[PDB]
Structures are given as structure tokens and as C-alpha cells.
Coordinates of C-alpha atoms and ligand atoms in Angstrom, one line a residue:
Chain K
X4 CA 23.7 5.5 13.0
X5 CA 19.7 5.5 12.1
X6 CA 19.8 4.9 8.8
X7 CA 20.1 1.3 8.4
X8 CA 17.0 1.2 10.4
X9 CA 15.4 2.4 7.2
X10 CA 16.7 -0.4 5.2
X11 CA 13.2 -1.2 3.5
X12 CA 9.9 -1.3 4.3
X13 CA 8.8 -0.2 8.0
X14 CA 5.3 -0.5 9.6
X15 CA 3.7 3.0 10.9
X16 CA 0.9 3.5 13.5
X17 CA -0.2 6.9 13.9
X18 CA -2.6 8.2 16.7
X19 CA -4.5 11.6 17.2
X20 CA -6.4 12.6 19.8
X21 CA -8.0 16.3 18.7
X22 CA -10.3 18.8 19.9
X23 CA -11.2 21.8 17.4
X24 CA -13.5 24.0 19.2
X25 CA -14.2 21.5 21.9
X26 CA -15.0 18.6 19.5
X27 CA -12.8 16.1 20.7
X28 CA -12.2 13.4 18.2
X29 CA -10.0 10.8 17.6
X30 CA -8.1 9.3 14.5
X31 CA -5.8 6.1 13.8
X32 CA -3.7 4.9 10.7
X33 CA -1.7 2.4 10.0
X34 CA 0.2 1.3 6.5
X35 CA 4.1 1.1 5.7
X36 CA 6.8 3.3 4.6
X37 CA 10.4 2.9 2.4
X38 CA 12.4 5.8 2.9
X39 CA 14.5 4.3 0.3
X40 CA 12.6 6.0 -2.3
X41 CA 10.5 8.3 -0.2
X42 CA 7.3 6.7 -0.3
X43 CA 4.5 6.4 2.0
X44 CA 1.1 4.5 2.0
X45 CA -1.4 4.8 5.2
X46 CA -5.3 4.1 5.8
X47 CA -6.5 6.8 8.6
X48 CA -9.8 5.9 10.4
X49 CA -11.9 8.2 12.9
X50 CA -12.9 5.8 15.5
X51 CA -14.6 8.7 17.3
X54 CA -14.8 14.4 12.4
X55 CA -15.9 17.9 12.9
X56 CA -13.3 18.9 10.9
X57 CA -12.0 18.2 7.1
X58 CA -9.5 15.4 6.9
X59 CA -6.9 18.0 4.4
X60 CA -6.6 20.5 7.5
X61 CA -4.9 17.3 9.7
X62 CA -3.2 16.0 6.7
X63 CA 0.5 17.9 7.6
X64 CA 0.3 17.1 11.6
X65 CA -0.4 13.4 10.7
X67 CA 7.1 10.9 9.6
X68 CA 9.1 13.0 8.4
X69 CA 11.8 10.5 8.7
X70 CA 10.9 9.0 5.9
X71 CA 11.3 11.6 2.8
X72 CA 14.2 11.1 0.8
X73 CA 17.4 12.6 1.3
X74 CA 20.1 12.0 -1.5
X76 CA 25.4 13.3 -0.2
X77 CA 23.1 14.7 2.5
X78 CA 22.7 11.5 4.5
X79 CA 24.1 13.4 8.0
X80 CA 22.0 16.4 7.3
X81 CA 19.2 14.4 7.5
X82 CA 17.6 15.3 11.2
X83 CA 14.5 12.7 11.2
X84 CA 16.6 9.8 11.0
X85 CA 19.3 10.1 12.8
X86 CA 17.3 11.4 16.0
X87 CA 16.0 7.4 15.5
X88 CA 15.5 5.6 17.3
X89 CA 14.8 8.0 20.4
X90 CA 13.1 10.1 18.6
X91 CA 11.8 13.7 18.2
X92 CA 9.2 16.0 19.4
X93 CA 7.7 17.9 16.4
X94 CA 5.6 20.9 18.1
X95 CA 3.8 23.2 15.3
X96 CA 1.5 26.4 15.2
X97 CA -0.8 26.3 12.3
X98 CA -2.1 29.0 11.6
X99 CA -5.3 29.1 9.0
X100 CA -6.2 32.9 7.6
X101 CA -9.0 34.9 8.8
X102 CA -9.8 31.7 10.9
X103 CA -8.6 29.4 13.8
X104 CA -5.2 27.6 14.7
X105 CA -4.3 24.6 15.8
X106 CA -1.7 23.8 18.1
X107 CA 0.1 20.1 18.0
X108 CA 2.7 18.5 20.2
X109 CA 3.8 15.4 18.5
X110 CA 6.5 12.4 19.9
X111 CA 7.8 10.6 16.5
X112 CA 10.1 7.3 17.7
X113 CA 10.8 3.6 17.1
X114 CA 8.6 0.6 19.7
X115 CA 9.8 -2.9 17.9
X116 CA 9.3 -3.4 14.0
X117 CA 7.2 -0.3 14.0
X118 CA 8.0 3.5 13.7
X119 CA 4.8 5.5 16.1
X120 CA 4.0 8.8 15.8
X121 CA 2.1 10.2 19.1
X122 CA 0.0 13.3 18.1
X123 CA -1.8 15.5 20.6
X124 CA -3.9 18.4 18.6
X125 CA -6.0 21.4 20.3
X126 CA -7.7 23.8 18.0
X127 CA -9.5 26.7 18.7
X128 CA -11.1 30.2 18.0
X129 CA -12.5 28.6 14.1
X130 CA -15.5 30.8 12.9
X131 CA -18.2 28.4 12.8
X132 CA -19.4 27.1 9.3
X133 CA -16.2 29.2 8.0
X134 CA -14.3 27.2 5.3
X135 CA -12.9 24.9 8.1
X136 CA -15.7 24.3 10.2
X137 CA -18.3 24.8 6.9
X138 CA -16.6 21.9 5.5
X139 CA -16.1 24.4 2.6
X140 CA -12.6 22.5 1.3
X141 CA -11.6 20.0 -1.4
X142 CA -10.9 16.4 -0.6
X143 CA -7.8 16.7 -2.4
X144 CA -4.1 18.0 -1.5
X145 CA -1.3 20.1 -3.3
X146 CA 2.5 20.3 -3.7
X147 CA 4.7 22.4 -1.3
X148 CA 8.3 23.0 -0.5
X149 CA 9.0 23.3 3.4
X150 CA 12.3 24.9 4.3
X151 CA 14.0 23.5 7.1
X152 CA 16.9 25.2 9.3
X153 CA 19.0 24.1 12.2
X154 CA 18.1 25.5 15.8
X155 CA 21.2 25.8 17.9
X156 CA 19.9 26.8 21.0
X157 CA 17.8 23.6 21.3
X158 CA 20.4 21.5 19.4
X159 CA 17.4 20.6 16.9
X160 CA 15.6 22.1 13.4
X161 CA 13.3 25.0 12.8
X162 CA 10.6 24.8 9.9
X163 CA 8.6 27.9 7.8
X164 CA 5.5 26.9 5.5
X165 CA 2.6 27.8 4.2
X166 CA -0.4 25.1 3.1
X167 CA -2.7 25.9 0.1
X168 CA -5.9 24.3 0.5
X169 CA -8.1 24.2 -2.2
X170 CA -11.4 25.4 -1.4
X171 CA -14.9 24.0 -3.1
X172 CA -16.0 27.4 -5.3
X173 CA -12.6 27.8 -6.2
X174 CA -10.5 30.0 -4.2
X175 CA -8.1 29.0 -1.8
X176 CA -7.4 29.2 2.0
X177 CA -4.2 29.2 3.3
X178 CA -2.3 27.9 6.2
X179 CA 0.7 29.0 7.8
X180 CA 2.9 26.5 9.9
X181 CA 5.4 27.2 11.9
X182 CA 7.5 23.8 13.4
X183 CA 10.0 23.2 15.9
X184 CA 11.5 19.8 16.2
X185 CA 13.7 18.7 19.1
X186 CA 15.6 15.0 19.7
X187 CA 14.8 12.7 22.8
X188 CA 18.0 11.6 23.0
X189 CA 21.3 12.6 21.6
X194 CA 23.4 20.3 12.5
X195 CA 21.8 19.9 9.5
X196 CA 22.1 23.1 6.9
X197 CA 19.6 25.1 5.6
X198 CA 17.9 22.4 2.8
X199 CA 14.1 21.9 1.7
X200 CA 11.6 18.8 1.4
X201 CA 9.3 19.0 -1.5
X202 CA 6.0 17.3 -1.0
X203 CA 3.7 15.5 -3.0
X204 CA 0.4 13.7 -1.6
X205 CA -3.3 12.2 -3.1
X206 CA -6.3 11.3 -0.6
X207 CA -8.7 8.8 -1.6
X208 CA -10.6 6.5 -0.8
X209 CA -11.7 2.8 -0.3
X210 CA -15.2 1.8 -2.1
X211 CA -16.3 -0.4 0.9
X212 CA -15.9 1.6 3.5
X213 CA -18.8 2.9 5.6
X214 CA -16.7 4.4 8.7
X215 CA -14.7 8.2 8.0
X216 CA -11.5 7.3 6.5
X217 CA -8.4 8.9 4.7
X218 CA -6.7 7.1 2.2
X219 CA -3.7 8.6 1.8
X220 CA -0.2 8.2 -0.9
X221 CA 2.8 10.4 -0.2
X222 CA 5.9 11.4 -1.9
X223 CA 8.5 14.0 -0.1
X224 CA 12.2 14.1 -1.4
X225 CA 15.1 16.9 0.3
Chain Z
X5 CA 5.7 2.1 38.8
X6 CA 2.4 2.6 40.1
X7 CA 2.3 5.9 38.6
X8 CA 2.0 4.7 35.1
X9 CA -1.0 3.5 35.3
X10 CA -3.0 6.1 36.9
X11 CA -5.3 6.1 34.2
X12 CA -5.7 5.4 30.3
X13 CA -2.9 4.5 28.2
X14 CA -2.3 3.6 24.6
X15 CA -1.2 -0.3 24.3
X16 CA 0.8 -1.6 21.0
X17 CA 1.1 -5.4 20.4
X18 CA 3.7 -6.6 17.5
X19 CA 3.3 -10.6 16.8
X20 CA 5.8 -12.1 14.5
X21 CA 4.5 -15.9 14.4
X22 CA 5.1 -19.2 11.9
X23 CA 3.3 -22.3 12.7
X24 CA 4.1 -25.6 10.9
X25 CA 6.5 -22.9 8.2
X26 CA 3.3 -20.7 7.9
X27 CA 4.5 -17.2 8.5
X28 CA 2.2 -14.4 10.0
X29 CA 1.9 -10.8 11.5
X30 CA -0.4 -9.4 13.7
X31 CA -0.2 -5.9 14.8
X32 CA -2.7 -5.0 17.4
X33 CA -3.2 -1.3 18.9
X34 CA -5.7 0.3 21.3
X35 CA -5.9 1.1 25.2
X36 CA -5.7 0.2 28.3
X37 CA -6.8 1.0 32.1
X38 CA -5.2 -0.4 35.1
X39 CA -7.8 1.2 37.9
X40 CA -10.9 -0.8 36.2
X41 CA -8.9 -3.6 34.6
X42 CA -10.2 -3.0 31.0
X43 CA -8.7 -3.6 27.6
X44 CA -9.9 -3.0 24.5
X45 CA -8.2 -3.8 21.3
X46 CA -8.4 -4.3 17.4
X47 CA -5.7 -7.1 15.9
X48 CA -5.0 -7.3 12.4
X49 CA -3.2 -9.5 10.7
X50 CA -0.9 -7.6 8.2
X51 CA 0.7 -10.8 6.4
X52 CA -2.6 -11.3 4.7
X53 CA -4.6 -14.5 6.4
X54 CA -3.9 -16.2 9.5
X55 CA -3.0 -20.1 9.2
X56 CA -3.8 -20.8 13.1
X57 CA -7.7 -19.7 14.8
X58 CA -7.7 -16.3 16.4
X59 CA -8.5 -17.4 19.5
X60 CA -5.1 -19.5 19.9
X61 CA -3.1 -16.0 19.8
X62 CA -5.2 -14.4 22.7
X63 CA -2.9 -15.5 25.6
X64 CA -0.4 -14.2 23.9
X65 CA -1.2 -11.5 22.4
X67 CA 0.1 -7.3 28.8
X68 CA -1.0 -9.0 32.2
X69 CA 0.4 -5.1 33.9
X70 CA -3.3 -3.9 33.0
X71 CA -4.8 -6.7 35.1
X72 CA -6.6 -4.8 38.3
X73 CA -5.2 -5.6 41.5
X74 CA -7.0 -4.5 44.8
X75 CA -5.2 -1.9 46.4
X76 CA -3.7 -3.8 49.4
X77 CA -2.2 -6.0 46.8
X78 CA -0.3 -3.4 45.0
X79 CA 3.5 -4.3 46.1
X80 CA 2.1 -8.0 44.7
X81 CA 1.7 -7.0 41.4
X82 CA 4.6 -7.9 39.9
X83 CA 3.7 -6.6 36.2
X84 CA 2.9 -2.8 37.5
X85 CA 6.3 -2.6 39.9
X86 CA 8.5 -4.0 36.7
X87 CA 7.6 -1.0 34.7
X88 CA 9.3 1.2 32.8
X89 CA 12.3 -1.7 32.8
X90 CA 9.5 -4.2 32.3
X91 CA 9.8 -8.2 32.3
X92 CA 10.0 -10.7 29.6
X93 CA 7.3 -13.2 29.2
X94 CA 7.8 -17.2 28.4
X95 CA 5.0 -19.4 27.8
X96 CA 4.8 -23.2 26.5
X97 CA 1.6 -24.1 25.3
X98 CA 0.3 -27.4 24.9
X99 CA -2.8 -28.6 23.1
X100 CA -4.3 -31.6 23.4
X101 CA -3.6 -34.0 20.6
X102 CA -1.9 -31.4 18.6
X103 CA 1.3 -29.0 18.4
X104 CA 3.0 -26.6 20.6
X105 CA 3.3 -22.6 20.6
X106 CA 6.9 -21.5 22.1
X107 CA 6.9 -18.4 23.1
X108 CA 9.2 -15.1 24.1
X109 CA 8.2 -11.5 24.5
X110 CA 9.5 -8.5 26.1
X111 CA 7.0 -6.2 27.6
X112 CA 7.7 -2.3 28.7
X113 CA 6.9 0.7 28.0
X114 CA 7.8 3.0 24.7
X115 CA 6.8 7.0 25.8
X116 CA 3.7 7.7 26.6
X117 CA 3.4 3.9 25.3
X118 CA 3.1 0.3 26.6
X119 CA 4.3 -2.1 24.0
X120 CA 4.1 -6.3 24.1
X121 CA 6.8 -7.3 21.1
X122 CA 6.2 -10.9 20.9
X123 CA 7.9 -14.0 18.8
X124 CA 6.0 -17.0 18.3
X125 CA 7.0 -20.9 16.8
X126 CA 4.0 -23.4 16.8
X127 CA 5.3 -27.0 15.8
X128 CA 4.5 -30.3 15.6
X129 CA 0.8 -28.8 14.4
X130 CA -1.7 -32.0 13.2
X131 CA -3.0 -31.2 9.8
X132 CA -6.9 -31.5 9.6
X133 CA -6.9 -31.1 13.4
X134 CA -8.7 -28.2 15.6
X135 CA -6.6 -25.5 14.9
X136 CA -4.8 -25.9 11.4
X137 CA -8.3 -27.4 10.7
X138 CA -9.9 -24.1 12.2
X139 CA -12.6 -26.0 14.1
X140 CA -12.2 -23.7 17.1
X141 CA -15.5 -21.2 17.8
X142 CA -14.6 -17.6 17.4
X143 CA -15.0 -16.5 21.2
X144 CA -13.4 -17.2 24.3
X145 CA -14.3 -18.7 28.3
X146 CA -13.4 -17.5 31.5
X147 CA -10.4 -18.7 33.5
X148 CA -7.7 -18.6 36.4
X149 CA -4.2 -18.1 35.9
X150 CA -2.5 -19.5 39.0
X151 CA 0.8 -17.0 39.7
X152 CA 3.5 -18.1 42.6
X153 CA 6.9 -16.7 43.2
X154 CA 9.9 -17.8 41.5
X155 CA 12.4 -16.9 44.2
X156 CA 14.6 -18.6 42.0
X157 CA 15.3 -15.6 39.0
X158 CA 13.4 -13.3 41.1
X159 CA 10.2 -13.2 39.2
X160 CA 6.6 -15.4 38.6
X161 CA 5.5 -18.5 37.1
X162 CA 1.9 -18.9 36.2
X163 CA 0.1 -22.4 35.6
X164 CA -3.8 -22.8 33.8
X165 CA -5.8 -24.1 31.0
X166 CA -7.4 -22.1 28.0
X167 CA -10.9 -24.1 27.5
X168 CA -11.4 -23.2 24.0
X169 CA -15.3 -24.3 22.1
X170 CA -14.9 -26.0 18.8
X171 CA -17.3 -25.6 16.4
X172 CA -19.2 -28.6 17.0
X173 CA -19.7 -28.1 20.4
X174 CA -16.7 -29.6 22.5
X175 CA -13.9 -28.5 24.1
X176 CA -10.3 -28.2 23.2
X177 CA -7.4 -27.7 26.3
X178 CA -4.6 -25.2 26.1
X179 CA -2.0 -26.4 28.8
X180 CA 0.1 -22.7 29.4
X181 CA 2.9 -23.0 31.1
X182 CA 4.9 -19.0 31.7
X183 CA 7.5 -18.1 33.4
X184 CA 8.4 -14.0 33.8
X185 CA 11.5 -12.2 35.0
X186 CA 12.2 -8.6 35.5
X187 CA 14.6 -6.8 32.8
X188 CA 15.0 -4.3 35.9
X189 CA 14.8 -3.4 39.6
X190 CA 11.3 -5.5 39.5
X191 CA 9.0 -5.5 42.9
X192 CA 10.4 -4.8 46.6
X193 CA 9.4 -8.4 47.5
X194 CA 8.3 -11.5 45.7
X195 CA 4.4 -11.8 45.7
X196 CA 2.7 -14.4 47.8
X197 CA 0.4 -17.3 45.9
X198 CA -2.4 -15.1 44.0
X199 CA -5.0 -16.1 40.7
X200 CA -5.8 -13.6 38.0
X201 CA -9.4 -14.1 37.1
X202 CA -9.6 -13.2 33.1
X203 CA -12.8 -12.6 31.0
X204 CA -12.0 -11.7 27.4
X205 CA -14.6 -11.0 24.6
X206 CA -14.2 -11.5 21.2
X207 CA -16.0 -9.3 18.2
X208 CA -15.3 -8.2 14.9
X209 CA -15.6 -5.1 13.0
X210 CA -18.5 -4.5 10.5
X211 CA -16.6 -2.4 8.1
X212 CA -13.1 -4.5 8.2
X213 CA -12.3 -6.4 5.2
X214 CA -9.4 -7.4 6.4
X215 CA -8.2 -10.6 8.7
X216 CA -8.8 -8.8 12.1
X217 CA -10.6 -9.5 15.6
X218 CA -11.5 -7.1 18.7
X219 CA -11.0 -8.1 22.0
X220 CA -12.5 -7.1 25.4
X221 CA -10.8 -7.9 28.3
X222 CA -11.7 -7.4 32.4
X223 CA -8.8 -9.0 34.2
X224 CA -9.1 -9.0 38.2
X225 CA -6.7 -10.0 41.1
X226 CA -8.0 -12.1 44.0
Ligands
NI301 NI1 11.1 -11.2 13.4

């Protein structure tokens, strides 16, 4: 119950509304996603970024990785289609945080994820604010485990950015996800992404491919 | 029911259309705000190309973000409808050609106010205005005449869309909508009122894509 709403292909919209350091900004995407075999294709715009595109890359569907004989354990779909509220604290080193409240849920056709991100205390012109990281992304396992108290899931990770001279910066999240309506064991997603981009296109845009299996 | 629209909120649109067989989706998203009466939205049709003129799908394509004076408040029956919402019929006619049918549901989704709309246009005149695509890309001012429909408890609206062909006539749009409450809708049935609509049309410079932009000022009278 959730799972044949994953069938085949499903429309996405995602919205962000941000502030890092009092830059509000704003971004939009749209694309589709099979959570059949764990793929995921979007086009994010900034209609209003004072920020590089890789630091909002994670709080941008989790529903949507694949999961193999651990169909029940998976959280993210069978909260559908009510939904859940992912909250995380990303933490970047020697530098700022972020703090997002997201509500991930079903309207229609489409599966919408509703993000509201606040950042603050990010040294200015540091690697974040500098604009000192690569447009690119890497590969990263994200242990998920089952919260009791709230009757949802707990997640620990930590985000390696690649950073322009060739060092990297780091980024600890720390995410709590709890169901809008009416538990899973201790499993992992591994994560695979590229960013790119469209040749005619003059506005600040991520193109974005993703790949997560449990 | 008031309440939810005490300022800005996030509108999606989901159009699943064929006209004459020809299959379509358009997705719109974008924002609304009750208190001034403004819309603003970017379509896009994600099927590829639209077979039917933009302009055709704009009555279709959330009449709760339409600004009502505030001693009309307990008349608007969109606003007092929400969260349950209502469902929206329409028959449209055009002159010397085909006929949209249409059903949506309209209510809100979280923070979220959604239109899911199906559309059938039949009976569709090859080479005519609008499988001919002879219809200007913009859009005129109009009345929408509501009354109350005692009879299921809701609205029926009656007007004409006045839309410019290329050439420089007109083509008529006979709408003909009927809307009921899923819910509890308004206290009492609201008395003989017009919505006065403006709408503009754009398009953005740096979509490739089928798309079009709409700005909207709707006011009660
Ligand atoms: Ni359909």
C-alpha cells in the first residue's frame, strides 16, 4: 500500500525557497522519476544564487531509490501518499549550516516536494560563499535507522564536496523524517549523481541525473 | 476558509487533454494571492507540442484567487469551499467548430492549492481557428456571470471568451460551468455577482520548450 503508486514513470515538481546569510533566493525543477530502477532526471531553475548549486544538491525524493525483499522496509513509499516531513541540519566544516524543513507528498499525477531552507553564520567568500567548489557531485552511502519515538526514520551522513584547487570540504547531515499520516531496520542507500548542463540556456540552471539503490 | 488565503501561496495546475485523438499534458506551477487578486504562472506542455492554441486552455487552466471585496466575503463561494474544495464543469462552445468537455477537482494539497483537470475537445474542424492555430497569442477582458444553484448547493457561471485570430477577427468561446462543493461549502448561497477577469499572456526568452506565462487580475463586483 504505496507502492503501486510507483508503477512507472511519475512527474516531480520541486520548490525552494532559501535564504543563506539573508540572500533569499528561490529555485524550481521539474523532470520525472521510475523508482522501478531508481532513476531520476530533473531541470532546476533559479527564478530569483548566492550560493553553489552542489551545497543544495542533497535537500533538493527519497521515495524513489530502489529498494530490492525489503519492499515494507522501505519508509518513503509507503508514507505515500500523505507523505513525510524530512527536517535536516547540514552542517559544512569550519563554515555555516543550513537548516531545511521539507513536506515530500502526492497532489494528482505528480509527486511535490515543498522545501523551506535558512542558512546562516557562512564566512564570506569561504569555499561556500567564495564559490570555491566544483560543479560536479560524488558517491555516498547514507545510513538510515528507524525512530520509535516519533514512529518515523533517523539518517547520519557526511557530503564530500570537491573543492576547485583540489581539496575537499565536507558536510555533515543529520535528517529526521516523520509521516503525515499513518519500522524499517537499520539499511543504507548508496547514491550516485552528475550535474550538467543545457547549451542554450542563459538563466542559472542544474541539470541534474540521479541514481540511489538500498 | 478565509484563512488560507491570507497571503501568497504556491498554485499547481495538472491538464491531461486529447482533442480530435490528439493527446497532451500541460503542467503549470507558480503563485497566487487572494488579497490583490494576482496570479502568475508558467505552463508547459510536457507531451511535447500542443495540437489546440494556448489560449483555448486558459479558462481552464483556480477562480478561489479571484479578489472579492471584503463585504462580499461569505459570497465567495471558491474561498469558503476550501480545504474540501469544489469540482468544476465547463462546456465550451466555439463558433463553427468543436467542443471542450470538461471536469476538474479543485482543493488544496499542504501548504498547496492544486486544479487537476481532464479535458475531451471533439467534433474539432480541421483547417479551422484552432486545429488551424489561427488564434493570436494573447487574451481580452471579460465577465463571468455567477448565480446560485440552489439546486446542488453551489454556482453556475455563464460568458463568452472573445478570442483575436491572427487576421484580425474575432472567434467566440460560449462557457457554460457549473461548480459544487466536495464539502461543507459557504453558509449561504451567494446572491447574483460578475467576476471581472484580465489575463496576460507572455513567454519566456530562455524556454525552448512548448510553454506560455500567464498574468491574471481577477476582481469581484
Ligand atoms: Ni489521465
Amino acid at each position: 500500500k504505496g507502492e503501486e503508486l510507483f508503477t512507472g514513470v511519475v512527474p516531480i515538481l520541486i520548490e525552494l525557497d532559501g535564504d543563506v546569510n539573508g540572500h533569499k533566493f528561490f529555485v524550481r525543477g521539474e523532470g520525472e522519476g521510475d523508482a522501478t530502477i531508481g532513476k531520476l532526471s530533473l531541470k532546476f531553475i533559479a527564478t530569483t544564487l548566492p550560493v553553489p548549486w552542489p551545497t543544495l544538491v542533497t535537500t533538493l525524493v527519497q521515495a524513489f531509490s530502489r529498494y530490492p525483499h525489503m519492499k515494507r522496509h522501505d519508509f518513503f513509499k509507503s508514507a505515500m501518499p500523505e507523505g513525510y516531513v524530512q527536517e535536516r541540519t547540514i552542517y559544512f566544516k569550519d563554515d555555516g549550516t543550513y537548516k531545511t524543513r521539507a513536506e515530500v507528498k502526492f497532489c494528482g499525477d505528480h509527486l511535490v516536494n515543498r522545501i523551506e531552507l535558512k542558512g546562516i553564520d557562512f564566512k564570506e567568500d569561504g569555499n561556500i560563499l567564495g564559490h570555491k567548489l566544483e560543479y560536479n557531485f560524488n558517491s555516498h552511502k547514507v545510513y538510515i535507522t528507524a525512530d520509535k519515538q516519533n514512529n518515523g526514520i533517523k539518517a547520519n551522513f557526511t557530503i564530500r564536496h570537491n573543492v576547485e584547487d583540489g581539496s575537499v570540504q565536507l558536510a555533515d547531515h543529520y535528517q529526521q523524517n516523520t509521516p503525515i499520516g499513518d519500522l524499517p531496520d537499520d539499511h543504507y542507500l548508496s547514491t550516485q549523481t552528475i550535474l550538467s548542463k543545457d547549451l542554450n540556456e542563459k538563466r542559472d540552471h542544474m541539470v541534474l541525473l540521479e541514481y540511489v539503490t538500498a
